[PDB]
Amino acid sequence: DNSPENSALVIHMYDGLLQMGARLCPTVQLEEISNHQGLTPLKLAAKEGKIEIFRHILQREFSGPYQPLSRKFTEWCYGPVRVSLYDLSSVDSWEKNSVLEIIAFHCKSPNRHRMVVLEPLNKLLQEKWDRLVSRFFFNFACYLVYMFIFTVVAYHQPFGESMLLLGHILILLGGIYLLLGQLWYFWRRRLFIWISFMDSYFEILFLLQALLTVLSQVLRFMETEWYLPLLVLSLVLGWLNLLYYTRGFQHTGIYSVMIQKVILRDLLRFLLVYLVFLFGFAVALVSLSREPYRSILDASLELFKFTIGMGELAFQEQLRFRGVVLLLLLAYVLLTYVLLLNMLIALMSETVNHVADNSWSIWKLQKAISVLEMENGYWWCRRKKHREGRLLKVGTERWCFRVEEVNWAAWEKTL
Amino acid sequence: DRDRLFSVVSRGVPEELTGLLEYLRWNSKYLTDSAYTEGSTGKTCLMKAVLNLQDGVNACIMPLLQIDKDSGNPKPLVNAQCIDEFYQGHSALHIAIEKRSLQCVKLLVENGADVHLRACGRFFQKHQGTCFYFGELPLSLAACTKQWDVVTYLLENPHQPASLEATDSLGNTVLHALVMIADNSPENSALVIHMYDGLLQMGARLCPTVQLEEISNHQGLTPLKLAAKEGKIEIFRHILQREFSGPYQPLSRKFTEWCYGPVRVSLYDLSSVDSWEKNSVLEIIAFHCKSPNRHRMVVLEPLNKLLQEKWDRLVSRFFFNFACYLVYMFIFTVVAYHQPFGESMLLLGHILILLGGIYLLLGQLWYFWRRRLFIWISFMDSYFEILFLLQALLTVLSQVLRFMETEWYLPLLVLSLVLGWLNLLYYTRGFQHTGIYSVMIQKVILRDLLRFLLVYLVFLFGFAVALVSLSREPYRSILDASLELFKFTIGMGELAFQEQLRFRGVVLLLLLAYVLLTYVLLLNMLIALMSETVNHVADNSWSIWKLQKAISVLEMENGYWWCRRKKHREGRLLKVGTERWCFRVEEVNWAAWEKTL
């Protein structure tokens, strides 16, 4: 457990058992045994969200006869700077079900954004991101060019005929490409969408957009006009998808945006309440109208348009019983004002209590997910095989990773 | 390498086996000039020997004497790493000092060690890799590591003494190095203050003729000016007001004259004064400094009173300039309004407007020439200087367009009118408006304007394109639809897209989607803005107002561009023998008086 006393007790017992097992049985390695799920103790700790024991296992050092069973080997320290040599087997390359892959996709605890900031994983992810930012921006540019072509073709379609036909063919090809890519992604990552829809909804939207545009092209070949609406949708949604790329050119994303995006767990209840209000009052009003307003849809749309300031009520005219229609309208207006005020207060209560100034960790987690996904390469041509090379083997026979730390506080406290 | 792997026998007699093996290679007596220095790429045997630290007393004296008794020409210490990899001149004496081994450095300086030669650890570039900066000198390294014994041995070393005024490649001295590594944490501040005072006293004792605090680096900054520029408030404050009783009285900056009760009359020291000195402490704090702490540095005891006196002197000219600008604005407004005997009045008004525009343009051009870097560093509290300039430029252009007999002067002139009135708000800081911390909160949140503007532009120009695409079977223009949606957003118009358009069920969906998205965006804006006022109370509007007044008085002490003011008079208070231009300040502290008895 994350409580300090439980963490201390479990750490002490873990180290004692490891040392005793090394002393009695020096030939067997107890930390390489996997359960029926195929998880070692380190991977299990990463998956279950136990941050304290996971961190302790990740960076532990022993001096003396217990040196071999250590994961961090301090090489040399000058001043407040220390050059340590951490150990791998938590690396994406050459290994399936890595620690980083489990943290990003399989883990579901709220602490997963605080686990990517640990010392070896931080530098590993930073190096991978610095390597792959070029492909990230190349993909951005390709999508932007596709969107410009799509917008121009849609706008200029009320020598030129050949250009329009070529544009339509390219739009169909791009839609097919995006559809296939998103289908492959959803095939590979079925469970991640269910676990963590909060930070993976864009993968849905893209797919949807692709599907829509493909359908539109089909409707253009059947000589029906109904292609025009769908295509228009496929336009606007596409532009919104560009916002997905705001995470590559250094936009933190703000903690407040996360606050609103997580408050939408309360959308269902408020939506149900508002729907009950709207479809009770509309039915009452159309019942008074009988002696047109025959449709429930007409009255509901009129009230909804008034609510968002898009129209006027205009129910006050005639209707004979003009003293009751007024009462119903005022009751509806007051109730919806109360509901909106309740929405606002419920939303705002979080920002005045939980400061949680940790946008950097969330941005790092987003970058980690992006680089993990794009290391596999494109669906039509899988990338070159994941090279295990992170740093040369050190005898300490172990694939290691050199990290440099600076700590003025620790240097000043010691003497 | 080879010697290291042959020196793996720690216990026993390792002093003689290496000597027997080495001698003079037993075959090349005179070939050791260059064939000896090839064991590694810079890590010589001596560095490994002093880096071992395997035993309590490492075997280092006798091998050094053995090499000294037979080799006199090949100095090993003078050789340094010529390759960027594996340090760039890191001598073994630095390792000896920093491993807290007085014996090792003592034995090294017994024979052949050259102190204060070079370290090239990190100055500006080249040697990098999150390295350690300590002034790249052995004495500076000893001082920064809190090693009094090493420093004491180095200063009065009988063999080779180390000068305390030595400068490194960057021009810094030991005091500059202590200033650079300073941090606002209490323990770091206490350590650096103690080391600074100890070094100052020791330098006074050993060398009473030199003054270490008047030495400037390549940038021309003394330790006090460097501390002011780098934003290290603690050491800057300690240096600003320090007093010593006894033989160390002369090297003090504050001299308490007389105290009655809770009131004390102290006599602070200058050389932080604007007048008679270029690159003063106040000038550096106001313009060159960029740390967030600059608004907390102007409230210190001598600077506060100095700035208050200067403001009390120059408020008259401040309000005179205000009155002149107000009169100019009234003339401009009347001339613009009454232009659909009188002809002569209108011509005179136009001539005066042209002259005022030229005057303002020249003044702002002079200001921008003098203060190029300040605009880039601190645009947050200096944007008015831009606006004025812009306005001036505009009005001048308008006058030109009036002489070409084109009507296009009328729009520009109108702009030059409205902007001018807004510029009057600049003068609200003179007649005692604090400005409110909340206004600063909004003015600093506009760092987030670019992201929200990009998001809103994407929304608007996606939805407008979709709507005009549906309109085709007028609304032909993207600009028309974008303007219509934008006008609806700010409550300036109505949508009116619901009429006809055949596909009336999709236009409605697009409009509702746009409205909901823009409401969500505005709510996000509001929550992001308001989150700061409920967490950071920061009730320090007085300091920000003092900083604004300081910038204003600093700028206006120079006088007008057409006639520079009378030369800055050094006179702040008469010279006191304590021969030093001083400044008398009176403090009252009931808490300190009550605590003491």
Numbering used by the authors:
A (entry chain D): 258 to 415, 429 to 561, 589 to 693, 701 to 719
B (entry chain A): 76 to 415, 429 to 561, 589 to 693, 701 to 719
Q: Which passages does the manuscript contain on this structure?
A:
TRPV2 is a ligand-operated temperature sensor with poorly defined pharmacology. Here, we combine calcium imaging and patch-clamp electrophysiology with cryo-electron microscopy (cryo-EM) to explore how TRPV2 activity is modulated by the phytocannabinoid Δ9-tetrahydrocannabiorcol (C16) and by probenecid. As expected from the previous studies, the channel architecture displays the classical domain-swapped homotetrameric assembly of TRP channels. Each subunit harbors a transmembrane domain of six transmembrane segments (S1–S6) with S1–S4 forming a separate voltage sensing-like domain, while S5-S6 and the intervening pore helix (PH) form the pore domain that lines the ion-conducting pathway.
As expected, the two structures obtained in the presence of C16 displayed relatively open configurations compared to TRPV2apo-1, in agreement with a functional response to the ligand. Although the binding for probenecid remains elusive, C16 associates within the vanilloid pocket. We tentatively assigned this density to C16 because of the associated structural changes in the channel pore region, and because of the lack of a similar density in other maps of available TRPV2 structures. However, the size and shape of the density does not completely match C16, which may relate to the limited resolution and the C16 occupancy. Consistent with C16 binding, residues H521 and Y525 that line the C16 pocket rotate considerably between TRPV2apo-1 and our two structures to provide space for the compound. Notably, no indication of a ligand at the CBD site is present in our structures obtained from C16-treated sample. The putative C16 binding is at a different position than that proposed for CBD in TRPV2CBD, which however is a closed structure and retains a lipid in the vanilloid pocket. Finally, an important observation from the comparisons of the structures determined is that C16 affects TRPV2 beyond the local binding pocket, and thereby significantly increasing the pore width along the conduction pathway (and see below). Taken together, these data indicate that D536 is a crucial residue involved in the interaction of TRPV2 with C16, and of importance for a proper synergistic interaction between the C16 binding site and a separate binding site for probenecid.
